[PDB]
Amino acid sequence: FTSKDTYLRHFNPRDYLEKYYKSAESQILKHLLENLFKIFCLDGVKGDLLIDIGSGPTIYQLLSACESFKEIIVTDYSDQNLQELEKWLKKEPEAFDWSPVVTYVCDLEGNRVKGPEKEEKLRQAVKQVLKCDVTQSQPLGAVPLPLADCLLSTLCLDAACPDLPTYRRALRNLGSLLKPGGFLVIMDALKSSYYMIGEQKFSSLPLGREAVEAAVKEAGYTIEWFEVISQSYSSTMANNEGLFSLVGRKLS
Ligand SMILES: Nc1ncnc2c1ncn2[C@@H]1O[C@H](CSCC[C@H](N)C(=O)O)[C@@H](O)[C@H]1O
Numbered sequence: 001f002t003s004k005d006t007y008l009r010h011f012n013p014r015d016y017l018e019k020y021y022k023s024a025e026s027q028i029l030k031h032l033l034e035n036l037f038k039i040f041c042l043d044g045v046k047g048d049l050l051i052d053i054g055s056g057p058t059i060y061q062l063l064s065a066c067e068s069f070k071e072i073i074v075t076d077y078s079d080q081n082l083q084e085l086e087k088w089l090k091k092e093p094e095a096f097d098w099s100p101v102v103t104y105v106c107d108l109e110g111n112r113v114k115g116p117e118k119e120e121k122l123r124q125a126v127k128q129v130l131k132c133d134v135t136q137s138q139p140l141g142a143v144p145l146p147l148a149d150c151l152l153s154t155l156c157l158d159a160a161c162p163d164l165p166t167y168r169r170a171l172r173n174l175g176s177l178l179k180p181g182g183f184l185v186i187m188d189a190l191k192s193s194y195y196m197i198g199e200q201k202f203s204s205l206p207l208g209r210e211a212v213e214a215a216v217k218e219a220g221y222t223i224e225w226f227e228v229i230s231q232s233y234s235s236t237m238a239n240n241e242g243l244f245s246l247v248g249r250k251l252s
């Protein structure tokens, strides 16, 4: 199973963005964006602080979220990935072009702003960029942070967790960052055992709906929403059966 080490040496953040975020990849990103819209815009989910866990080099998962949460902390294990994110934050020439994705979100949200203004609201929202390891009982390190109103994690936990016990423990580690009554939002692959960035292979925990749901409940959360798309990534990308999106509340 892919080690943390392999992420630092061999996960190329720009290639990942080229592979997935420029087909099945399109159809899945469309669906994830519509779920995020639903969760952050239509549903309750609101607050002062959202912490995004395993952000990678991506910002798509934060586009509707910056409308509901004053402040966003982005986090990942790989500093190389956070640096790729930071290129976008700082509006650098070589930064990835999220404009097609941003426009789609603006569309979903009733065209009340244009892309530029939406991007400026996300850049304004992101307050800290920090290191994170979900396998650590203190995932963000030795210094305390304020407790979050929401924890967001997209396509991270299956890749971070080599087995079911570690998966449960990661949910409890992350819970320590969340205030009681805080929301846990997870989107991840279903029954996937690997994914690809070009020729480089990464492991995935092949988890099913029942296993995900039982694990989230055991870790001390209620499930408010669980939704499945049974769309696999392209044949050279992953062997997932589909993707899930769950919303949970930490117990009070
Ligand atoms: N132990 C760990 N703790 C936190 N993040 C980890 C981790 N192991 C791997 N990761 C990170 O998990 C991410 C998976 S790629 C997911 C990126 C993004 N959230 C998206 O939705 O596309 C990578 O950025 C990788 O560095």
Ligand SMILES: C[n+]1cccc(C(N)=O)c1
Binding pocket: 155, 156, 158, 159, 189, 192, 193, 194, 195, 203, 204, 205, 238, 240
């Ligand atoms: C980061 N990522 C992207 C696509 C699929 C997977 C997976 N866990 O199968 C992970």
